[PDB]
């Protein structure tokens, strides 16, 4: 005996806006003016999650995604997949997936549990669009409404290594464990293959309510894109937003570049063409800018991604690593030890 | 211009024995009395790999995997790709991998790398067969068949986790990871799902010339399974090995038991089970016999899994932080710092 809530019922976190179709990340009817590609990834789900809470002993989850092609460098979990957190002790902890098949799957999420009064996080899929999403409790159990987990929006821009490839499973893309560390939302607008700084990008970006941008967008655009792109990127920005911090973050060296010296080199022509605007940037005295160098991302053993460019969740670790500590400094926000 | 060699014709690193299907784990015909879903998992390729040298600035891969289902919690890279070292600095290193398709295959690893000499490893799929391989070189460089790069016969049994799930590729599962860390053999013999212990699996381990046993076989049978079969295993094992040193290891606590009373239960009781069967083989007197204790196996924080149970590459890592002293203490092998 199982009741399902739909998700719309309850409480959808890291969203930059209200605005759109309920699952997507950005109303791609108003912002129009984008790149078609653009407009279809923030159609996928990365970086949502429903927050909810509940005595049931078990969760499950009903939800259909179309049957769109699985990337062969992530998991299904990762990209059409659910992730469960519940609180216990003040932190977040993981619970259990939801483990995709066709475009409908009915999983129990956990169970067994007890029935305590539970706080629930449910992360949604990170490279797939979530057409539906029903939460299921025990028949006697309530299932309510859940409060905001995080402070403030921190709005994160960049590639797919945003977006999450190649974490294991959503709840694991970089900006969700930021979240989880800090309490603070770190909202992501990672776009596979697509992170490139166009202007109607930074348009609909500058809308946002931000208390931060951070811009991890250079794995994606050529040196001659980031040189040609990125002031008026910066620039349209602060029309909108005079004061609010901009964090401009070196690509991290892809491993492609161990023996392809001409990855390799076409990575440090990325970083370098990045540089150099920030010096434009500079010299036309623009506030509160800062600028993350790459220093060690990915450690220095050569094992941290998937397929030498997509961060695994050890890449993933040793990133936030050195990530946390930058971050902290400039926006003042506390990471838990 | 690219002339192709099989693999056949390079060097096979990995397997326990000679016998069988060239890139077969196990004779499967030979041992035709294991279980018929442990035979099929010997036919998947987990932990061997391909040994050469060549001098090409490019590396190609033309290979044929059966159009098996993917599962869900691998990534296809993992499941179905192949995974390319290159040896730098004494040190093997990553260089590229093998994207997976459909059933054939025809890939750049890597390229624009230059034409000194290089000593390459080429990891095979952890979750699929291998039905053939050719290897791919600029037509005026030369390829040559390797050196053997590791040293002994270190045969590891066990589950799931030990057969690759969920490492990101193939050269992320532990025991490949063992093995370039301390140029010893790791052998991998995970069998998902099939790790129970049975009899006649144990007969097929006892004719290997091993240097010594691990035996991370407590994730799959059920506790009574563990009390019925664990000494008739380690008995068949010593009625060929008098002397070869033979580890146990207890079961990871798996992340399912976080909230899952049940699950957690189950794993308790596992553990219980191996402990009291370790007791009576010590009572038996069986001589070099060891046993490892669970010891936060995948950290503090239940975020080194992909779905509960198979760890993640992060989780991985955690456990080879606490295999490799143990496992140096007792077989006298050191591992690069």
């Given at each position: 005996n199982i009741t399902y809530v739909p998700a719309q019922e309850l409480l959808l976190v890291?969203?930059?806006?209200?605005?759109?179709?309920?699952?997507?990340?950005?109303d791609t009817a108003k912002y129009?003016?984008?790149?078609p590609t653009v407009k279809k990834l923030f159609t996928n789900s990365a970086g949502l999650a429903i927050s909810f809470t509940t005595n049931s002993p078990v969760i499950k989850a009903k939800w259909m995604v179309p049957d769109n092609y699985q990337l062969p460098n992530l998991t299904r979990v990762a990209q059409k997949g659910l992730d469960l957190y519940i609180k216990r002790d003040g932190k977040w902890q993981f619970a259990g997936v939801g483990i995709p098949g066709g475009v409908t799957t009915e999983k129990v999420?956990?169970?067994?549990?007890?029935?305590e009064e539970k706080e629930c996080l449910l992360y949604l899929p990170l490279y797939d669009e979530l057409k539906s999403l029903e939460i299921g409790v025990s028949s006697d159990a309530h299932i309510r409404k859940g409060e905001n987990p995080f402070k403030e929006k921190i709005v994160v821009y960049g590639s797919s290594i945003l977006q999450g490839?190649?974490?294991?499973?959503?709840?694991?893309?970089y900006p969700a464990r930021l979240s989880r560390s800090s309490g603070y939302n770190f909202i992501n607008l990672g776009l596979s293959?697509?992170?490139?700084?166009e202007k109607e990008v930074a348009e609909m970006l500058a809308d946002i309510d931000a208390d931060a941008f951070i811009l991890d967008?250079?794995?994606?655009?050529?040196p001659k894109e980031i040189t040609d792109r990125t002031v008026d990127f910066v620039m349209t920005l602060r029309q909108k937003h005079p004061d609010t911090p901009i964090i401009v973050i070196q690509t991290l060296?892809?491993?492609?570049?161990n023996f392809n010296q001409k990855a390799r080199e076409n990575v440090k022509r990325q970083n370098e063409a990045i540089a150099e605007q920030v010096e434009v940037l500079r010299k036309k005295n623009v506030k509160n800018l800062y600028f993350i160098k790459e220093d060690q991302f990915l450690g220095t053993?050569?094992?941290?991604?998937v397929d030498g460019t997509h961060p695994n969740d050890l890449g993933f670790d040793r990133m936030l690593k050195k990530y946390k500590p930058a971050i902290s400094k400039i926006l003042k926000i506390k990471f838990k030890a």
């Open positions: 890291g969203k930059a806006t209200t605005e759109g179709e309920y699952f997507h990340r950005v129009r003016t984008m790149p999420l956990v169970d067994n549990m007890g029935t490839a190649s974490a294991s499973r959503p709840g694991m893309a293959g697509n992170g490139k700084m967008c250079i794995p994606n655009p050529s060296i892809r491993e492609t570049g053993d050569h094992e941290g991604t």
